[PDB]
Short mmCIF file of C-alpha atoms in Angstrom, two decimals:
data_model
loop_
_atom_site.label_atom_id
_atom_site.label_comp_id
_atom_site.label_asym_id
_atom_site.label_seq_id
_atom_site.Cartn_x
_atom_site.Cartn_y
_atom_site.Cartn_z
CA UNK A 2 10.27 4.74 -17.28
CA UNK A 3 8.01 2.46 -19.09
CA UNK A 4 4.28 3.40 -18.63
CA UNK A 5 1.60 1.24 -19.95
CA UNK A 6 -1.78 2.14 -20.64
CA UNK A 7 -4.79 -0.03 -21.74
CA UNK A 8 -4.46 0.75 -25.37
CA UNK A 9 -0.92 -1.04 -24.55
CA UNK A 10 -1.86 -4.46 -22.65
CA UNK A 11 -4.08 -7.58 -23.82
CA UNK A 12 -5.88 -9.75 -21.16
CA UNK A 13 -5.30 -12.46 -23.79
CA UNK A 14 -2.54 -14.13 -22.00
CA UNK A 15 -4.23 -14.58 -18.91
CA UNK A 16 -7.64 -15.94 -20.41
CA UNK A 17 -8.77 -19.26 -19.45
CA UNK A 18 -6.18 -19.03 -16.84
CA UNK A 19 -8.00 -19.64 -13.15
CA UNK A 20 -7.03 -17.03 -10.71
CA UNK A 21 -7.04 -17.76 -6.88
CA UNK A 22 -7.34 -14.54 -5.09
CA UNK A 23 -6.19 -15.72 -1.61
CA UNK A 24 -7.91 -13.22 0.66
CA UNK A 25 -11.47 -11.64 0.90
CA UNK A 26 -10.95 -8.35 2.98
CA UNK A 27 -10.99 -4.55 0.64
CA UNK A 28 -7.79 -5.32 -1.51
CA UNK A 29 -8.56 -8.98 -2.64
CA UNK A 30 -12.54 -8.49 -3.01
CA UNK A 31 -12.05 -5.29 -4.84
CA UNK A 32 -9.25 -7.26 -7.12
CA UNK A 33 -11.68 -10.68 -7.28
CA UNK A 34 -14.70 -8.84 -8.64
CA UNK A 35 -12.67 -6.39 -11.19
CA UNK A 36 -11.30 -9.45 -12.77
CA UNK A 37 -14.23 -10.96 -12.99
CA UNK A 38 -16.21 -8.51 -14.15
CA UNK A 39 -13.20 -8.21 -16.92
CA UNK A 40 -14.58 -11.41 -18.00
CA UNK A 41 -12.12 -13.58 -16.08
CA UNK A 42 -11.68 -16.88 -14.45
CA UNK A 43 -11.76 -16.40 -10.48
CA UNK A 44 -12.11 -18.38 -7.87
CA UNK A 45 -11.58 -17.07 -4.31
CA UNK A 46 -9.20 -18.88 -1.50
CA UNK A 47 -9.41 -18.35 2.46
CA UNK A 48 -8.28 -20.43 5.55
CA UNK A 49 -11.70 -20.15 7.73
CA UNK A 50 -15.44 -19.89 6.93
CA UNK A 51 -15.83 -16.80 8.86
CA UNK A 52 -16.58 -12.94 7.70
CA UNK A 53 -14.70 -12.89 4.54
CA UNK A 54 -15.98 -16.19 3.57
CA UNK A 55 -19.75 -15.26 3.82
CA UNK A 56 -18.90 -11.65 1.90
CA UNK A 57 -17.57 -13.89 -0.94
CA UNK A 58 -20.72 -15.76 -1.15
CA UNK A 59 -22.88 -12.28 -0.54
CA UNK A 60 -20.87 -11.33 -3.55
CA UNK A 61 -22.08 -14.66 -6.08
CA UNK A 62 -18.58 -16.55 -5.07
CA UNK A 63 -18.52 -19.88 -3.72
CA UNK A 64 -14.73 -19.68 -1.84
CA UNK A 65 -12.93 -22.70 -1.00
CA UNK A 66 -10.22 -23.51 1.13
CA UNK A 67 -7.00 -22.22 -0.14
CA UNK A 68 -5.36 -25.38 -0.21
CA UNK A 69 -7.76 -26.45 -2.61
CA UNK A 70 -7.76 -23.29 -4.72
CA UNK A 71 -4.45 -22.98 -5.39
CA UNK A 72 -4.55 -26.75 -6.51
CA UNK A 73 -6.55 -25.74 -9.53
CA UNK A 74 -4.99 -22.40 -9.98
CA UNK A 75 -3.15 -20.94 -12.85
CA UNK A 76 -2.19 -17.26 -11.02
CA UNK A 77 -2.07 -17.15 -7.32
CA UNK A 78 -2.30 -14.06 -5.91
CA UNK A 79 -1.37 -13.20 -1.72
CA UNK A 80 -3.66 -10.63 -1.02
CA UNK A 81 -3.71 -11.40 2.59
CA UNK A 82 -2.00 -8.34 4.95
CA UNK A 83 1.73 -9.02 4.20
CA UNK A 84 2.73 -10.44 8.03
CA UNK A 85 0.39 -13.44 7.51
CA UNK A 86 1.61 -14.65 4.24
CA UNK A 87 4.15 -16.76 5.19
CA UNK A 88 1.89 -18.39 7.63
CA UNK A 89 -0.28 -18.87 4.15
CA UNK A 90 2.16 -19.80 2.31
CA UNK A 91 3.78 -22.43 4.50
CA UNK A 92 0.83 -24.02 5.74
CA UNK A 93 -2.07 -24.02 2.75
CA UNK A 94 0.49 -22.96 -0.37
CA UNK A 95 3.66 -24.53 -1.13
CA UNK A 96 2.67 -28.23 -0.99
CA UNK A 97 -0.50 -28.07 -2.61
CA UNK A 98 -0.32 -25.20 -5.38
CA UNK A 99 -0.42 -26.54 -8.85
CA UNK A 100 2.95 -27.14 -10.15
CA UNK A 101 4.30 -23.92 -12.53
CA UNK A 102 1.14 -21.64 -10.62
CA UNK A 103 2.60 -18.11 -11.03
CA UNK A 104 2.91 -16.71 -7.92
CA UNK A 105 1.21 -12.95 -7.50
CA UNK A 106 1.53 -10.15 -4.89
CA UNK A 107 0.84 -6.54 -4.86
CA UNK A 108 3.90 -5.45 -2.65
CA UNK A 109 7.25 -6.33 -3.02
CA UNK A 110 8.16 -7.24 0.50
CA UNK A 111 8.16 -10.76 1.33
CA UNK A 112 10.01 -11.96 -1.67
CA UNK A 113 12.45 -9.77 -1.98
CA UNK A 114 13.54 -9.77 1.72
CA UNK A 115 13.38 -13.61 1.50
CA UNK A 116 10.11 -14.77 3.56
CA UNK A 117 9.34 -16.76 1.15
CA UNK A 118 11.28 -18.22 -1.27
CA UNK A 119 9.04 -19.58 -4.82
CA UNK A 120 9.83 -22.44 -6.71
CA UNK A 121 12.26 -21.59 -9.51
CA UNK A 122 9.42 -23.31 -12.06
CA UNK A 123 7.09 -20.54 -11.13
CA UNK A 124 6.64 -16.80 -12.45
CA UNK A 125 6.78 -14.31 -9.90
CA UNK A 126 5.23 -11.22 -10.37
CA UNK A 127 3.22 -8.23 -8.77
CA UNK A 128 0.85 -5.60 -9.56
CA UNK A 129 1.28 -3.00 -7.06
CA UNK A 130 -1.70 -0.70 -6.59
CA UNK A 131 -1.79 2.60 -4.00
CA UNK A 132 -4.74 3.03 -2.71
CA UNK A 133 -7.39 1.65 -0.79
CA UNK A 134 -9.64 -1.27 -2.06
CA UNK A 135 -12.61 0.35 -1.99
CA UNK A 136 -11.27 2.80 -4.27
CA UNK A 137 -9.46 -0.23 -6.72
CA UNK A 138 -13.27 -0.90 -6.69
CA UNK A 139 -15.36 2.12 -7.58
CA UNK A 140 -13.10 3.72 -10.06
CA UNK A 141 -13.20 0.07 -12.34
CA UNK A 142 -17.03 0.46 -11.98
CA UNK A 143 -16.72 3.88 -13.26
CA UNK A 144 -14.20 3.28 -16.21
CA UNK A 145 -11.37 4.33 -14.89
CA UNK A 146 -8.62 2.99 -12.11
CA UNK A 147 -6.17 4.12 -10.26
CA UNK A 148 -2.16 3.95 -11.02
CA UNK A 149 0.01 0.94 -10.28
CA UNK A 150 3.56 -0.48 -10.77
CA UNK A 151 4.35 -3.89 -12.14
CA UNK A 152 7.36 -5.80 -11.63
CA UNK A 153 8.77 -9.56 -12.27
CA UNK A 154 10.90 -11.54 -9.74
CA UNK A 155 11.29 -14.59 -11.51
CA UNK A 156 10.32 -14.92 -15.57
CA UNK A 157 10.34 -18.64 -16.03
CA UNK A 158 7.72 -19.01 -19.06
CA UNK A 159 9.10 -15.49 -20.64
CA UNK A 160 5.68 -14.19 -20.80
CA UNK A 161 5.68 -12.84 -16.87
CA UNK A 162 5.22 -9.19 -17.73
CA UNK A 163 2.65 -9.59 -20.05
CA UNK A 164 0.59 -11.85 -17.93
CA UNK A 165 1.14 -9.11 -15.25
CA UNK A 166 0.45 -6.57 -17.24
CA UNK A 167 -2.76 -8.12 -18.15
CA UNK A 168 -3.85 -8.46 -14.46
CA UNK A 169 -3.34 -4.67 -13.81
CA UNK A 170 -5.48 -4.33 -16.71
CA UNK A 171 -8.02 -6.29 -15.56
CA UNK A 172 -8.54 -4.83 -12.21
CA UNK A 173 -8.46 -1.22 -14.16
CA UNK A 174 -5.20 -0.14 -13.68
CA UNK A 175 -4.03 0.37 -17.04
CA UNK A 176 -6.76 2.94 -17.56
CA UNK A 177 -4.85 5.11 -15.35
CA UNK A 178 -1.52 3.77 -16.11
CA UNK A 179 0.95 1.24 -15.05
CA UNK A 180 4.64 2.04 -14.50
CA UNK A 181 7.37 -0.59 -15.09
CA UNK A 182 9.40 -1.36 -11.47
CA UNK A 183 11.06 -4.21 -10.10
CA UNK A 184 10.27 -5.88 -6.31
CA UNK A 185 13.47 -4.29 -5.26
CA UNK A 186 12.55 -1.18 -5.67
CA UNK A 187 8.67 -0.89 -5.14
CA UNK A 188 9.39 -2.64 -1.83
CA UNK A 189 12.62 0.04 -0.81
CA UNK A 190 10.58 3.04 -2.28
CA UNK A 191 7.86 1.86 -0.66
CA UNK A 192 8.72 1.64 2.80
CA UNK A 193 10.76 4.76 2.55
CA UNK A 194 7.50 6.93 1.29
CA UNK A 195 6.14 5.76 4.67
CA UNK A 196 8.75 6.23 6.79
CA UNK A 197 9.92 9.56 5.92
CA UNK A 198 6.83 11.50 4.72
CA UNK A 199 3.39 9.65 3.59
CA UNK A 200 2.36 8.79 7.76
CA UNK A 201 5.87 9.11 9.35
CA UNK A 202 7.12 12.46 8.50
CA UNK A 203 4.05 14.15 8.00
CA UNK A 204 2.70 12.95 11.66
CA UNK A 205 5.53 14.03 13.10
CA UNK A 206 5.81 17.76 11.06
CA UNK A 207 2.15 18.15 12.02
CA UNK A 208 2.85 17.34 15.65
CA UNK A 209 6.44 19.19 16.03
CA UNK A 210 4.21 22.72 14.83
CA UNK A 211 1.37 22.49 16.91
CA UNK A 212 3.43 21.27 20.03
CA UNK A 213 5.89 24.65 18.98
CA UNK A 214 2.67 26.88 19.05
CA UNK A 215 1.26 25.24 22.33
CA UNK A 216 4.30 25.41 24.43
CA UNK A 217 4.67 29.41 23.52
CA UNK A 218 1.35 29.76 25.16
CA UNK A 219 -1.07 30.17 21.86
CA UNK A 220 -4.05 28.64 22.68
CA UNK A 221 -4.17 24.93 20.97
CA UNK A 222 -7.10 25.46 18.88
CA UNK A 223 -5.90 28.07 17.11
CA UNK A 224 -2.43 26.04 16.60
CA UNK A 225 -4.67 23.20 15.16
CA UNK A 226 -6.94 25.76 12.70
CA UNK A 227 -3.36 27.31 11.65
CA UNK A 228 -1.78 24.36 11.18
CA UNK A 229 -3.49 21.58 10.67
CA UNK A 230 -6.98 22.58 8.90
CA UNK A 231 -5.87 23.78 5.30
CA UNK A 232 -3.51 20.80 5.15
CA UNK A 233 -5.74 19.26 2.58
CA UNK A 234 -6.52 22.40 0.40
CA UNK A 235 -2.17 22.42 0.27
CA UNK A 236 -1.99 18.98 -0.40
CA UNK A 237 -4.71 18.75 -2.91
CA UNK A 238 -3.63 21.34 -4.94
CA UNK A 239 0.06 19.25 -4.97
CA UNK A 240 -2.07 16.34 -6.25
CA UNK A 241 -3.35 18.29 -8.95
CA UNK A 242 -0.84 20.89 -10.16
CA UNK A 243 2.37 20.07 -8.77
CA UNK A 244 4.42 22.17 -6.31
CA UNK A 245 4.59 24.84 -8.45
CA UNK A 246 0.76 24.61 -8.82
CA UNK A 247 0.58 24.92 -5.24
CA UNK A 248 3.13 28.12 -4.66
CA UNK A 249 1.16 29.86 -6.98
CA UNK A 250 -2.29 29.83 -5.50
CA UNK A 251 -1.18 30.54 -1.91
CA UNK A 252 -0.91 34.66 -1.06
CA UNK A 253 2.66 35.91 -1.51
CA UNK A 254 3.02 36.17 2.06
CA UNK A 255 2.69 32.31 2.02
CA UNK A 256 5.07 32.12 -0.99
CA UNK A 257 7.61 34.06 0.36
CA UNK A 258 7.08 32.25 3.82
CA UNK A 259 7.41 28.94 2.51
CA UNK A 260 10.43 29.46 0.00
CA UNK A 261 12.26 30.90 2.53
CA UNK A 262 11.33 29.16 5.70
CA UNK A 263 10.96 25.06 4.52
CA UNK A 264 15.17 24.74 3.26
CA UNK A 265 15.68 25.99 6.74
CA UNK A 266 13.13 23.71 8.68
CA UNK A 267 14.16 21.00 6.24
CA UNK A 268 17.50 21.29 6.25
CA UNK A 269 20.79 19.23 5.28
CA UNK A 270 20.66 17.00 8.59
CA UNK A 271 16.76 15.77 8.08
CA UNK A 272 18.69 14.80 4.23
CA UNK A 273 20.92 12.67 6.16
CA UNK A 274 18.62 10.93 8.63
CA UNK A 275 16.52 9.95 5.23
CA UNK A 276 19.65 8.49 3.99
CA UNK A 277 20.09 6.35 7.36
CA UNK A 278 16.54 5.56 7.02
CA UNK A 279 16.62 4.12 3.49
CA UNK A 280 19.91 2.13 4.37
CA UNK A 281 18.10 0.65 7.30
CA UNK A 282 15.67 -0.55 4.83
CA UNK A 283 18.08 -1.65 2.12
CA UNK A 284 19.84 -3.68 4.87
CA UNK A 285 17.27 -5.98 5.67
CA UNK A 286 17.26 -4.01 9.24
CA UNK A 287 14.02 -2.54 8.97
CA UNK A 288 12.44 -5.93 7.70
CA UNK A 289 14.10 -7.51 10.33
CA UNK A 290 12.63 -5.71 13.72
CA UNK A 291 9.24 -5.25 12.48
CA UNK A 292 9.17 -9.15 11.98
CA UNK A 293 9.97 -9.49 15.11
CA UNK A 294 7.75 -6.71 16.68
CA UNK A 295 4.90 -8.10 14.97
CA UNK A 296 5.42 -11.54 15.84
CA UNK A 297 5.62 -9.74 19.36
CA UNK A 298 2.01 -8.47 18.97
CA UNK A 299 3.27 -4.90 17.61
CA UNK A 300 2.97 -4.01 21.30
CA UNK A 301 5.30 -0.61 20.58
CA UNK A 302 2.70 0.54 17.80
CA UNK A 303 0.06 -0.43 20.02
CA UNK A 304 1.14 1.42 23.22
CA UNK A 305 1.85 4.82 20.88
CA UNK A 306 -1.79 4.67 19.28
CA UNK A 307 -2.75 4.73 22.86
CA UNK A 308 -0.74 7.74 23.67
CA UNK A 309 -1.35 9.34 20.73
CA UNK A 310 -4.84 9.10 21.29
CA UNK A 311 -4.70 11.38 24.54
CA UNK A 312 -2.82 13.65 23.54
CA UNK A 313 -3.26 17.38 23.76
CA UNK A 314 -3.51 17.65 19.44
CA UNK A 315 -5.71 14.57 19.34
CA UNK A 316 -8.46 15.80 21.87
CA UNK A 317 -8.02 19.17 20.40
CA UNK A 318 -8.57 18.06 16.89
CA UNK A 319 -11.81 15.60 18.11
CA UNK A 320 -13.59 18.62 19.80
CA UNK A 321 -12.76 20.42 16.31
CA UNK A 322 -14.15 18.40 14.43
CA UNK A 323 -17.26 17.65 16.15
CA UNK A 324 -17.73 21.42 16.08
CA UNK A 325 -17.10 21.61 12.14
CA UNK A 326 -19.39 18.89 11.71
CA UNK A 328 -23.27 21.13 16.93
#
Protein backbone atom coordinates (compact mmCIF):
# COMPACT_ATOMS: atom_id res chain seq x y z
CA UNK A 1 0.00 0.00 0.00
CA UNK A 2 0.99 3.54 -0.11
CA UNK A 3 1.07 5.18 3.41
CA UNK A 4 1.68 8.79 3.81
CA UNK A 5 2.80 10.49 6.73
CA UNK A 6 3.21 14.28 7.45
CA UNK A 7 6.87 14.36 6.71
CA UNK A 8 5.30 13.17 3.17
CA UNK A 9 2.37 15.79 2.34
CA UNK A 10 2.47 19.77 1.86
CA UNK A 11 -0.68 21.88 2.63
CA UNK A 12 0.80 24.08 -0.11
CA UNK A 13 -1.59 23.07 -2.73
CA UNK A 14 -4.56 23.76 -0.91
CA UNK A 15 -3.47 27.31 0.48
CA UNK A 16 -5.48 30.22 -0.39
CA UNK A 17 -7.96 27.75 -1.53
CA UNK A 18 -11.54 28.50 0.45
CA UNK A 19 -12.96 25.40 1.90
CA UNK A 20 -16.80 25.03 2.48
CA UNK A 21 -17.32 22.47 5.09
CA UNK A 22 -21.05 21.74 4.42
CA UNK A 23 -22.22 20.51 7.81
CA UNK A 24 -21.72 21.62 11.52
CA UNK A 25 -22.54 18.41 13.62
CA UNK A 26 -19.01 16.24 15.31
CA UNK A 27 -17.43 15.24 11.86
CA UNK A 28 -17.62 18.65 9.96
CA UNK A 29 -16.91 20.97 13.18
CA UNK A 30 -14.10 18.77 14.24
CA UNK A 31 -12.79 18.92 10.34
CA UNK A 32 -13.72 23.01 10.12
CA UNK A 33 -11.67 23.96 13.15
CA UNK A 34 -8.51 21.48 12.39
CA UNK A 35 -8.17 23.18 9.12
CA UNK A 36 -8.35 26.23 10.39
CA UNK A 37 -6.32 26.01 13.05
CA UNK A 38 -3.77 24.50 10.22
CA UNK A 39 -3.82 27.97 9.08
CA UNK A 40 -6.48 27.49 6.42
CA UNK A 41 -9.19 29.19 4.55
CA UNK A 42 -12.72 27.95 5.93
CA UNK A 43 -15.85 28.99 5.70
CA UNK A 44 -18.74 26.86 7.01
CA UNK A 45 -22.12 25.96 4.85
CA UNK A 46 -25.62 24.76 6.37
CA UNK A 47 -29.30 24.81 5.07
CA UNK A 48 -31.08 26.29 8.41
CA UNK A 49 -30.06 28.73 11.19
CA UNK A 50 -30.77 26.29 13.83
CA UNK A 51 -28.29 24.25 16.40
CA UNK A 52 -25.42 23.75 14.18
CA UNK A 53 -25.60 27.20 12.93
CA UNK A 54 -25.33 28.91 16.42
CA UNK A 55 -22.31 26.21 17.42
CA UNK A 56 -20.50 27.64 14.33
CA UNK A 57 -20.81 31.09 15.55
CA UNK A 58 -20.06 29.82 19.42
CA UNK A 59 -17.01 28.55 17.68
CA UNK A 60 -15.75 32.35 15.96
CA UNK A 61 -17.52 31.20 12.44
CA UNK A 62 -19.95 33.25 10.76
CA UNK A 63 -21.82 30.20 8.49
CA UNK A 64 -23.75 31.02 5.55
CA UNK A 65 -26.15 29.34 3.55
CA UNK A 66 -24.66 26.62 1.54
CA UNK A 67 -25.78 27.86 -1.60
CA UNK A 68 -23.79 30.76 -1.04
CA UNK A 69 -20.72 28.98 0.29
CA UNK A 70 -20.14 26.77 -2.21
CA UNK A 71 -20.41 29.82 -4.67
CA UNK A 72 -17.13 31.11 -3.34
CA UNK A 73 -15.61 27.79 -2.66
CA UNK A 74 -12.51 26.22 -3.94
CA UNK A 75 -12.97 22.50 -1.99
CA UNK A 76 -16.40 21.47 -1.05
CA UNK A 77 -16.63 19.04 1.33
CA UNK A 78 -20.29 16.82 2.23
CA UNK A 79 -19.94 16.28 5.68
CA UNK A 80 -23.58 16.01 6.20
CA UNK A 81 -24.80 12.13 7.35
CA UNK A 82 -24.52 10.39 3.91
CA UNK A 83 -28.64 9.85 3.30
CA UNK A 84 -29.09 13.65 3.16
CA UNK A 85 -26.51 14.52 0.66
CA UNK A 86 -28.27 14.17 -2.28
CA UNK A 87 -31.01 16.23 -0.89
CA UNK A 88 -27.82 18.82 -0.44
CA UNK A 89 -26.54 18.35 -3.34
CA UNK A 90 -29.58 18.67 -5.56
CA UNK A 91 -31.17 21.44 -3.94
CA UNK A 92 -28.23 24.04 -2.51
CA UNK A 93 -25.06 22.36 -4.64
CA UNK A 94 -25.05 21.61 -8.19
CA UNK A 95 -26.43 24.90 -9.60
CA UNK A 96 -24.71 27.23 -7.52
CA UNK A 97 -21.12 25.69 -6.67
CA UNK A 98 -18.33 27.55 -8.30
CA UNK A 99 -17.49 26.11 -11.55
CA UNK A 100 -14.20 23.47 -11.28
CA UNK A 101 -15.04 23.42 -7.02
CA UNK A 102 -13.49 20.01 -6.14
CA UNK A 103 -15.92 18.06 -4.73
CA UNK A 104 -14.92 16.34 -1.09
CA UNK A 105 -16.39 13.49 1.01
CA UNK A 106 -15.13 11.32 3.69
CA UNK A 107 -16.95 8.02 2.59
CA UNK A 108 -17.08 6.57 -0.57
CA UNK A 109 -20.73 5.80 -0.89
CA UNK A 110 -22.74 8.15 -2.76
CA UNK A 111 -20.44 8.53 -5.67
CA UNK A 112 -19.50 5.44 -6.29
CA UNK A 113 -23.01 3.85 -6.16
CA UNK A 114 -24.14 6.78 -8.38
CA UNK A 115 -26.32 9.25 -6.05
CA UNK A 116 -24.73 11.77 -7.28
CA UNK A 117 -23.07 12.14 -10.26
CA UNK A 118 -20.12 15.43 -10.29
CA UNK A 119 -19.39 17.43 -13.08
CA UNK A 120 -16.59 15.90 -15.15
CA UNK A 121 -14.67 19.59 -14.69
CA UNK A 122 -14.46 18.88 -11.03
CA UNK A 123 -11.89 16.79 -8.80
CA UNK A 124 -13.42 14.28 -6.76
CA UNK A 125 -11.82 13.17 -3.86
CA UNK A 126 -12.17 11.93 -0.14
CA UNK A 127 -10.40 11.75 3.01
CA UNK A 128 -11.85 9.00 4.90
CA UNK A 129 -11.34 9.16 8.65
CA UNK A 130 -12.61 6.20 11.36
CA UNK A 131 -13.52 7.50 14.20
CA UNK A 132 -15.68 9.76 15.89
CA UNK A 133 -15.41 13.64 15.53
CA UNK A 134 -14.77 14.38 18.77
CA UNK A 135 -11.84 12.28 18.62
CA UNK A 136 -10.69 13.87 14.79
CA UNK A 137 -10.77 16.83 17.30
CA UNK A 138 -8.79 16.21 20.45
CA UNK A 139 -6.02 14.18 19.04
CA UNK A 140 -5.15 17.42 16.35
CA UNK A 141 -5.17 19.54 19.59
CA UNK A 142 -2.79 17.17 21.05
CA UNK A 143 -0.36 16.67 18.01
CA UNK A 144 -1.36 13.76 16.83
CA UNK A 145 -4.57 12.29 14.66
CA UNK A 146 -6.01 9.44 13.97
CA UNK A 147 -5.55 7.14 10.62
CA UNK A 148 -7.40 7.74 7.37
CA UNK A 149 -7.61 6.58 3.70
CA UNK A 150 -7.55 8.86 0.70
CA UNK A 151 -8.84 8.16 -2.58
CA UNK A 152 -9.62 10.12 -6.07
CA UNK A 153 -12.78 9.57 -8.20
CA UNK A 154 -12.22 11.95 -10.77
CA UNK A 155 -8.49 13.78 -11.29
CA UNK A 156 -9.36 16.57 -13.65
CA UNK A 157 -6.54 19.25 -12.66
CA UNK A 158 -3.89 16.19 -12.03
CA UNK A 159 -3.12 17.51 -8.70
CA UNK A 160 -6.33 15.59 -6.87
CA UNK A 161 -4.22 13.45 -4.57
CA UNK A 162 -2.07 15.97 -3.46
CA UNK A 163 -4.75 18.43 -2.69
CA UNK A 164 -6.32 15.46 -0.77
CA UNK A 165 -3.54 14.54 0.74
CA UNK A 166 -3.08 17.96 2.02
CA UNK A 167 -6.59 18.03 3.61
CA UNK A 168 -5.91 14.81 5.65
CA UNK A 169 -2.97 16.63 6.72
CA UNK A 170 -4.62 19.43 7.78
CA UNK A 171 -7.21 17.91 9.92
CA UNK A 172 -4.12 15.72 11.50
CA UNK A 173 -4.35 12.70 9.79
CA UNK A 174 -1.09 12.38 8.33
CA UNK A 175 0.43 12.41 11.80
CA UNK A 176 -0.97 9.08 12.22
CA UNK A 177 -0.88 8.07 8.69
CA UNK A 178 -2.88 8.04 5.59
CA UNK A 179 -3.28 4.94 3.41
CA UNK A 180 -3.79 5.22 -0.40
CA UNK A 181 -7.54 3.60 -1.45
CA UNK A 182 -9.89 4.26 -4.05
CA UNK A 183 -13.99 5.08 -3.46
CA UNK A 184 -14.56 1.60 -4.66
CA UNK A 185 -13.04 0.04 -2.22
CA UNK A 186 -13.25 2.22 1.04
CA UNK A 187 -17.00 2.23 0.31
CA UNK A 188 -17.17 -2.04 -0.28
CA UNK A 189 -14.64 -2.54 2.68
CA UNK A 190 -16.44 -0.31 4.45
CA UNK A 191 -19.80 -1.53 4.58
CA UNK A 192 -18.57 -5.05 4.82
CA UNK A 193 -16.48 -4.20 8.26
CA UNK A 194 -19.99 -3.27 9.48
CA UNK A 195 -21.92 -5.82 8.33
CA UNK A 196 -20.01 -8.78 9.20
CA UNK A 197 -18.06 -7.88 12.39
CA UNK A 198 -17.48 -4.06 13.60
CA UNK A 199 -21.64 -3.75 14.97
CA UNK A 200 -23.18 -6.64 12.90
CA UNK A 201 -21.27 -9.66 13.73
CA UNK A 202 -20.06 -8.78 16.94
CA UNK A 203 -23.84 -7.91 18.21
CA UNK A 204 -24.95 -10.88 17.07
CA UNK A 205 -21.75 -13.27 18.55
CA UNK A 206 -22.34 -11.40 21.81
CA UNK A 207 -26.05 -12.13 21.75
CA UNK A 208 -25.93 -15.89 20.22
CA UNK A 209 -23.46 -16.71 23.70
CA UNK A 210 -25.36 -15.20 26.27
CA UNK A 211 -28.80 -16.39 24.79
CA UNK A 212 -26.75 -20.19 24.66
CA UNK A 213 -25.88 -19.73 28.45
CA UNK A 214 -29.45 -18.41 29.40
CA UNK A 215 -31.51 -20.99 27.74
CA UNK A 216 -29.27 -23.91 29.60
CA UNK A 217 -30.52 -22.40 32.76
CA UNK A 218 -27.18 -20.35 33.98
CA UNK A 219 -28.35 -17.50 35.55
CA UNK A 220 -28.04 -14.34 32.99
CA UNK A 221 -25.76 -12.32 34.98
CA UNK A 222 -23.24 -14.57 35.16
CA UNK A 223 -23.65 -15.22 31.18
CA UNK A 224 -23.18 -11.38 30.82
CA UNK A 225 -19.88 -11.17 33.42
CA UNK A 226 -18.53 -14.36 31.36
CA UNK A 227 -19.19 -13.14 28.27
CA UNK A 228 -19.61 -9.90 27.79
CA UNK A 229 -17.44 -7.94 30.57
CA UNK A 230 -13.70 -8.67 29.50
CA UNK A 231 -14.72 -8.02 25.90
CA UNK A 232 -12.75 -4.85 26.00
CA UNK A 233 -9.57 -6.09 27.89
CA UNK A 234 -9.65 -8.89 24.56
CA UNK A 235 -10.23 -6.36 22.20
CA UNK A 236 -7.84 -3.83 23.48
CA UNK A 237 -5.08 -5.92 23.67
CA UNK A 238 -5.96 -6.80 19.61
CA UNK A 239 -5.68 -3.00 19.17
CA UNK A 240 -2.41 -2.95 20.60
CA UNK A 241 -0.48 -6.16 19.92
CA UNK A 242 -2.22 -7.98 17.35
CA UNK A 243 -3.89 -11.42 17.69
CA UNK A 244 -0.96 -12.95 18.59
CA UNK A 245 -0.51 -10.21 21.28
CA UNK A 246 -3.74 -11.17 22.53
CA UNK A 247 -3.29 -15.27 22.65
CA UNK A 248 -0.42 -14.70 24.57
CA UNK A 249 -1.64 -12.80 27.56
CA UNK A 250 -4.81 -14.89 28.08
CA UNK A 251 -4.18 -18.24 30.55
CA UNK A 252 -3.48 -21.35 28.47
CA UNK A 253 -6.75 -22.63 29.28
CA UNK A 254 -8.05 -19.61 27.22
CA UNK A 255 -5.42 -20.30 24.51
CA UNK A 256 -6.11 -23.68 24.09
CA UNK A 257 -9.96 -22.84 24.32
CA UNK A 258 -9.91 -20.35 21.75
CA UNK A 259 -7.52 -22.09 19.11
CA UNK A 260 -9.48 -24.92 19.24
CA UNK A 261 -13.01 -23.81 19.74
CA UNK A 262 -13.31 -20.32 17.27
CA UNK A 263 -12.45 -22.52 13.55
CA UNK A 264 -15.29 -24.59 14.82
CA UNK A 265 -17.78 -21.75 15.91
CA UNK A 266 -16.50 -19.87 12.88
CA UNK A 267 -16.56 -22.25 10.51
CA UNK A 268 -16.54 -22.67 6.53
CA UNK A 269 -20.41 -21.75 6.17
CA UNK A 270 -20.17 -18.22 8.26
CA UNK A 271 -17.00 -17.85 5.22
CA UNK A 272 -19.66 -18.22 2.76
CA UNK A 273 -22.48 -16.05 4.11
CA UNK A 274 -19.53 -13.17 4.23
CA UNK A 275 -19.03 -13.85 0.67
CA UNK A 276 -22.95 -13.39 -0.06
CA UNK A 277 -22.75 -10.44 2.07
CA UNK A 278 -19.95 -8.61 0.24
CA UNK A 279 -21.63 -9.51 -3.22
CA UNK A 280 -24.80 -7.96 -1.96
CA UNK A 281 -22.80 -4.93 -1.47
CA UNK A 282 -20.75 -5.06 -4.67
CA UNK A 283 -24.13 -5.38 -6.50
CA UNK A 284 -25.56 -2.24 -5.70
CA UNK A 285 -28.21 -4.52 -3.59
CA UNK A 286 -27.29 -3.41 -0.32
CA UNK A 287 -27.21 0.37 -1.47
CA UNK A 288 -30.30 -0.19 -2.98
CA UNK A 289 -32.78 -1.34 0.08
CA UNK A 290 -31.29 0.82 2.60
CA UNK A 291 -32.19 3.80 0.21
CA UNK A 292 -35.27 2.78 0.22
CA UNK A 293 -35.66 1.84 3.97
CA UNK A 294 -34.41 5.09 4.86
CA UNK A 295 -36.46 7.04 2.64
CA UNK A 296 -39.13 4.77 4.48
CA UNK A 297 -38.16 6.29 7.88
CA UNK A 298 -35.69 3.21 8.69
CA UNK A 299 -38.81 1.88 10.41
CA UNK A 300 -37.06 -1.91 10.48
CA UNK A 301 -33.94 -0.40 12.41
CA UNK A 302 -36.23 1.49 14.42
CA UNK A 303 -38.62 -1.31 15.54
CA UNK A 304 -35.28 -3.67 16.41
CA UNK A 305 -33.66 -0.82 18.67
CA UNK A 306 -36.95 -1.09 20.37
CA UNK A 307 -36.74 -4.76 20.85
CA UNK A 308 -33.40 -4.83 21.50
CA UNK A 309 -33.85 -2.53 24.15
CA UNK A 310 -36.10 -5.04 26.25
CA UNK A 311 -34.46 -7.67 25.91
CA UNK A 312 -33.34 -10.13 28.53
CA UNK A 313 -29.19 -9.14 27.75
CA UNK A 314 -30.07 -5.45 27.57
CA UNK A 315 -31.87 -5.17 31.05
CA UNK A 316 -29.34 -7.54 32.33
CA UNK A 317 -26.42 -5.54 31.17
CA UNK A 318 -28.27 -1.95 32.48
CA UNK A 319 -28.71 -3.39 36.08
CA UNK A 320 -24.86 -4.39 35.61
CA UNK A 321 -23.74 -1.59 34.98
CA UNK A 322 -25.46 0.57 37.34
CA UNK A 323 -24.06 -1.84 39.92
CA UNK A 324 -20.33 -1.45 38.53
CA UNK A 325 -20.77 2.11 38.54
CA UNK A 326 -24.69 1.76 44.18
Amino acid sequence: AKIYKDEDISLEPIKNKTIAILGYGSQGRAWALNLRDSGLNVVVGLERQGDSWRRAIDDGFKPMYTKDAVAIADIIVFLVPDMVQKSLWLNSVKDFMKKGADLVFAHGFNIHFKIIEPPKDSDVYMIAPKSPGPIVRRSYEMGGGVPALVAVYQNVSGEALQKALAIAKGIGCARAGVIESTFKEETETDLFGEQVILVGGIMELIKASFETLVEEGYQPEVAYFETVNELKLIVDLIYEKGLTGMLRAVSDTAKYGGITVGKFIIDKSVRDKMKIVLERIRSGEFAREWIKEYERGMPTVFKELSELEGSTIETVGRKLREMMFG
